[PDB]
Design a protein around this ligand. Structure first.
Ligand SMILES: C[C@]12OC[C@H](O)[C@H]1O[B-](O)(O)O2
Length: 339
């Protein structure tokens, strides 16, 4: 709460549903280069998390850049990567550092339930247009001055999808445990969604839930702790890729192939795990649509057209039973720009 649902926000503001639908159609269709020429190259700053097992951020940037080049948009890209185990203070520092640069657009990610007012205050203190990655639920407080774009793949949707699938894999009252992200927005929107739906619809019983540092090692450690205290579960729900892959390592170590485990995002490492059989299911992002959306949103802004506040991309479900052909087809769709 303090957030709009994606679909709810689109229901409340039809103009926005039009703008977002239009953007989706623009993403789907062939590049249509910049109508109105620019005065000079546009300056773009990026603050993203580096050194993760998840390829989402790097792929995102790659697709963004490809699409910019095809729209004949002339840009300069200053990329900053935050070291892992980087505090939120450290992230905020990287962020101010990037604001010094006085760029036209700033693309970044930050926990908005832990640094809500910080971001609200950055918003009110620069002419740089902000794009918030990996969030698709606009903040209610910010009605006076929303950022230029919230962009991502809606966490609650993907979680609902996973919930529905686990509902098919297992009978009512199944015991399970959860591996959250770090405390904050992602855990709330991927984990609690899942727990709520699964409890309400299938009467599953949660045996334990653990926060992580959002790293592979942490998902491994947390899986080990969790199974040490609660060995008897039929599956573990993981809130993210790195945590899932750590947990897979732990499950192999403890010899627990009787436990099911999901991925979250469906990037390359996950798809490999799925094809190996290590990961049982995932919800796959059609990854590149969000890089392209951002490039399309900047075009419109430069052609002086209205830009929607939010854009979410779509998902597919993938299981270890899917054929190589299905997988390759999905990769063809998701990594069309970033390969
Ligand atoms: C993008 C992301 O969101 C949280 C984490 O940064 C990534 O891991 B992930 O692939 O599970 O989704």
């Amino acid at each position: 709460n303090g957030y709009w649902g994606y679909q709810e926000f689109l229901d409340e503001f039809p103009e926005q549903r039009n703008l977002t639908n239009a953007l989706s159609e623009a993403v789907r269709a062939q590049p249509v280069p910049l109508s109105k020429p620019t005065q000079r190259p546009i300056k773009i700053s990026v603050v993203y998390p580096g050194q993760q097992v998840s390829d989402y951020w790097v792929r995102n940037i790659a697709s963004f850049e490809k699409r910019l080049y095809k729209l004949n948009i002339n840009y300069q890209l200053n990329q900053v990567f935050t070291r892992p185990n980087a505090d939120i203070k450290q992230q905020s520092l990287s962020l101010m550092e990037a604001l010094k640069s006085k760029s036209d657009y700033l693309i970044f990610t930050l926990d908005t339930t832990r640094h809500r007012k910080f971001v609200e205050h950055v918003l009110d203190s620069t002419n740089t247009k902000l794009i918030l990655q990996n969030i698709t639920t606009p903040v209610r407080e910010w009605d006076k001055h929303q950022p230029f774009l919230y962009v991502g793949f809606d966490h609650a949707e993907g979680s609902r999808e996973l919930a529905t699938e686990f509902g098919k894999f297992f009978p009512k009252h199944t015991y399970y445990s959860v591996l959250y992200f770090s405390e904050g927005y992602i855990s709330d929107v991927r984990g609690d969604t899942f727990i709520h739906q699964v409890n309400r619809d299938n009467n599953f019983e949660l045996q334990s839930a653990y926060y992580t540092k959002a790293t592979k090692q942490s998902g491994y450690d947390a899986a080990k702790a969790s199974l040490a205290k609660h060995p008897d579960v039929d599956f573990i729900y993981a809130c993210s890729t790195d945590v899932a892959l750590g947990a897979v390592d732990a499950l192999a170590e403890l010899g627990r192939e009787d436990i099911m485990i999901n991925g979250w995002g469906g990037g390359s490492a996950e798809l490999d795990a799925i094809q190996k059989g290590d990961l049982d299911i995932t919800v796959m992002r059609m990854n590149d649509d969000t890089g392209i959306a951002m490039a399309e949103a900047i075009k419109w802004d430069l052609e002086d057209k209205p830009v929607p506040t939010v854009y979410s991309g779509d998902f597919e479900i993938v299981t270890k039973a899917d054929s190589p052909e299905r997988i390759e087809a999905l990769k063809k769709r998701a990594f069309r720009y970033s390969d």
